[PDB]
Amino acid sequence: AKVVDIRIDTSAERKPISPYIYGSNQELDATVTAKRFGGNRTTGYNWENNFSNAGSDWLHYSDTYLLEDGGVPKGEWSTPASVVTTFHDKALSKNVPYTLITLQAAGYVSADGNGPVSQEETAPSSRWKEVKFEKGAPFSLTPDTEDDYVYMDEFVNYLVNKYGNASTPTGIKGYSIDNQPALWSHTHPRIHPDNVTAKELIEKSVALSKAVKKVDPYAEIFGPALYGFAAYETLQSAPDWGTEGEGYRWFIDYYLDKMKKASDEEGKRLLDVLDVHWYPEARGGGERICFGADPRNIETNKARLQAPRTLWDPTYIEDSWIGQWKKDFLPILPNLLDSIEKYYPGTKLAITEYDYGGGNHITGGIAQADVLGIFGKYGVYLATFWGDASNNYTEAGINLYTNYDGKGGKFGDTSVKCETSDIEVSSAYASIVGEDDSKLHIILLNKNYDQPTTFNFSIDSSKNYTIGNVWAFDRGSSNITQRTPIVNIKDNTFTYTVPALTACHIVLE
Numbered sequence: 015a016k017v018v019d020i021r022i023d024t025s026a027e028r029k030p031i032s033p034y035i036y037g038s039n040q041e042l043d044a045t046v047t048a049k050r051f052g053g054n055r056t057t058g059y060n061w062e063n064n065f066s067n068a069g070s071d072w073l074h075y076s077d078t079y080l081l082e083d084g085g086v087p088k089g090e091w092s093t094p095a096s097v098v099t100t101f102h103d104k105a106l107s108k109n110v111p112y113t114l115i116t117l118q119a120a121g122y123v124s125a126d127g128n129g130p131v132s133q134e135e136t137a138p139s140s141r142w143k144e145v146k147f148e149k150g151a152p153f154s155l156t157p158d159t160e161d162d163y164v165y166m167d168e169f170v171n172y173l174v175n176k177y178g179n180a181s182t183p184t185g186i187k188g189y190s191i192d193n194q195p196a197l198w199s200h201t202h203p204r205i206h207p208d209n210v211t212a213k214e215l216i217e218k219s220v221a222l223s224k225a226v227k228k229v230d231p232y233a234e235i236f237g238p239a240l241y242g243f244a245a246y247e248t249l250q251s252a253p254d255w256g257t258e259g260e261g262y263r264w265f266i267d268y269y270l271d272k273m274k275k276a277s278d279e280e281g282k283r284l285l286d287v288l289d290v291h292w293y294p295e296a297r298g299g300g301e302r303i304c305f306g307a308d309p310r311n312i313e314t315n316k317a318r319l320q321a322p323r324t325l326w327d328p329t330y331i332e333d334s335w336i337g338q339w340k341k342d343f344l345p346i347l348p349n350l351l352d353s354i355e356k357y358y359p360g361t362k363l364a365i366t367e368y369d370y371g372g373g374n375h376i377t378g379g380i381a382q383a384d385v386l387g388i389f390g391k392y393g394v395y396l397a398t399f400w401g402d403a404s405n406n407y408t409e410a411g412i413n414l415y416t417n418y419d420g421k422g423g424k425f426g427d428t429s430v431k432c433e434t435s436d437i438e439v440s441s442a443y444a445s446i447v448g449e450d451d452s453k454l455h456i457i458l459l460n461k462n463y464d465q466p467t468t469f470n471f472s473i474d475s476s477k478n479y480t481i482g483n484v485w486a487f488d489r490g491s492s493n494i495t496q497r498t499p500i501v502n503i504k505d506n507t508f509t510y511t512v513p514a515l516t517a518c519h520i521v522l523e
């Protein structure tokens with residue numbers, strides 16, 4: 015009989031949970047709170063005509079993929095930024111409060127949709143249009159598709175003119191400085207064949223941020239949208255890191271320090287959110303937990319359940335090259351936040367791409383719910399899962415926080431102290447709404463694979479809870495269903511036994 019104690023103090027460690035951590039990149043069967051227009055296809059996206067290039071994902075084809083995949087009405091295909099406006103219109107219609115639009119910095123964007131771009135057509139060439147961050151001439155709502163340039167600030171002007179600036183209810187709140195710069199030379203060799211240098215990325219980031227903020231001083235700039243750890247540490251062995259990196263523990267510090275330096279010289283914040291992608295390298299059962307992981311592999315599934323701990327738990331060492339050789343940089347979130355405090359205080363943190371795998375498996379749902387609890391507890395500002403609607407359990411993990419009852423019910427927006435006596439077999443996150451603890455929300459996850467776990471709750475609150483309604487998902491179904499309510503609470507204490515591999519959302523009042 016596995017017994018675990020959960021102790022909550024609604025008055026201690028109160029901290030706001032950013033509403034934007036429950037987002038997605040793709041269109042999901044879940045209620046999300048942030049939508050990101052990013053990824054490989056956005057690097058060469060031309061807002062003037064909506065064409066884009068697949069790069070290495072698909073024979074370097076320049077075509078209308080984004081219009082088709084984005085479900086843009088055929089009649090708007092030739093309309094400037096229709097890919098983006100359709101994306102944002104959809105977000106607004108679904109009541110999504112935050113939209114993040116990737117801007118182009120690799121250097122060039124598709125001039126057409128004529129198919130494969132040969133190596134002999136590497137930019138510059140008739141197949142590409144050169145990107146310039148600042149037009150330096152009056153903006154037009156009908157950009158010239160005949161000249162050789164595409165302007166980022168004109169692009170932003172078009173959007174602000176349509177939706178208002180970032181400070182308004184319908185404005186687009188954030189812009190990203192392209193996508194995975196350290197992989198430009200690998201993913202988009204036809205646009206940026208040389209490995210990006212640290213100097214180049216900073217120069218571009220500063221220039222694009224300045225250009226954007228002159229049009230919308232309220233917009234938040236996200237960067238550098240690094241693909242993974244190697245980029246975090248050395249910008250994927252950047253050609254100039256041996257010199258630029260002197261005195262810096264990792265590229266992360268260099269980026270923050272240089273962006274702050276530029277902001278200080280300019281007179282305003284140029285980097286609002288440190289943006290990185292985190293695809294777990296954690297392994298189990300002889301395979302990575304994400305990217306083609308086999309749901310039949312029990313060891314992989316168990317490793318998936320524990321992987322979230324690499325995000326915050328100093329005592330957890332995963333089975334991966336990162337856990338083995340980069341302990342000095344783990345747990346990851348605290349290290350990223352520590353760097354921010356040291357080189358650019360006030361900077362926010364976002365994980366714009368992540369996937370713990372097993373999306374169609376219970377462990378993918380529990381890990382997802384765990385990750386979201388972690389993002390909320392440790393101060394992450396925005397997060398957007400990368401994966402399609404087939405990840406039913408991942409979607410359940412999101413809805414457990416954003417719409418657990420199917421009618422808008424959601425986790426509180428203020429995190430409170432909630433400790434568990436066994437972080438290996440369980441996870442628990444608590445929250446209240448605003449500064450009021452009348453209703454106490456609790457995300458309770460039982461990671462026990464084949465046995466139930468009994469939880470003894472002890473809560474300190476100004477209120478005396480008399481009922482705890484429950485909603486949960488498990489191996490039986492990814493549909494979140496309401497369960498029998500907890501009714502025997504004595505002096506804010508009660509015992510609740512949860513079946514193996516179950517994720518619950520308890521609402522006390």
Ligand SMILES: OC[C@H]1O[C@@H](O[C@H]2[C@H](O)[C@@H](O)[C@H](O[C@H]3[C@H](O)[C@@H](O)[C@H](O[C@H]4[C@H](O)[C@@H](O)[C@H](O[C@H]5[C@H](O)[C@@H](O)[C@H](O)O[C@@H]5CO)O[C@@H]4CO)O[C@@H]3CO)O[C@@H]2CO)[C@H](O)[C@@H](O)[C@@H]1O
Pocket residue numbers: 052053054055056067068071072075077079082193194241291367
């Ligand atoms: O529609 C008629 C038309 O079809 C043309 O052929 C199409 C084909 O029909 C489409 O299915 C195909 O779609 C692919 C896209 O071209 C390609 O850009 C896209 O690339 C994805 C990739 O699949 C995905 O893994 C990737 O995720 C990465 C993120 O982008 C990174 O940020 C992150 O770090 O890492 C993840 C991966 O872990 O995202 C990119 C997109 O950004 O994949 C699509 C599916 O394969 O396109 C074909 C060409 O347009 C046909 O040619 C025409 O003749 C016909 O009329």
Ligand SMILES: [Ca+2]
Pocket residue numbers: 062157158159160161162163164165
């Ligand atoms: Ca142009």
Ligand SMILES: [Cl-]
Pocket residue numbers: 193194195196197239240241242245
């Ligand atoms: Cl990168």
Ligand SMILES: [Zn+2]
Pocket residue numbers: 042043402403404405406409
């Ligand atoms: Zn789905």
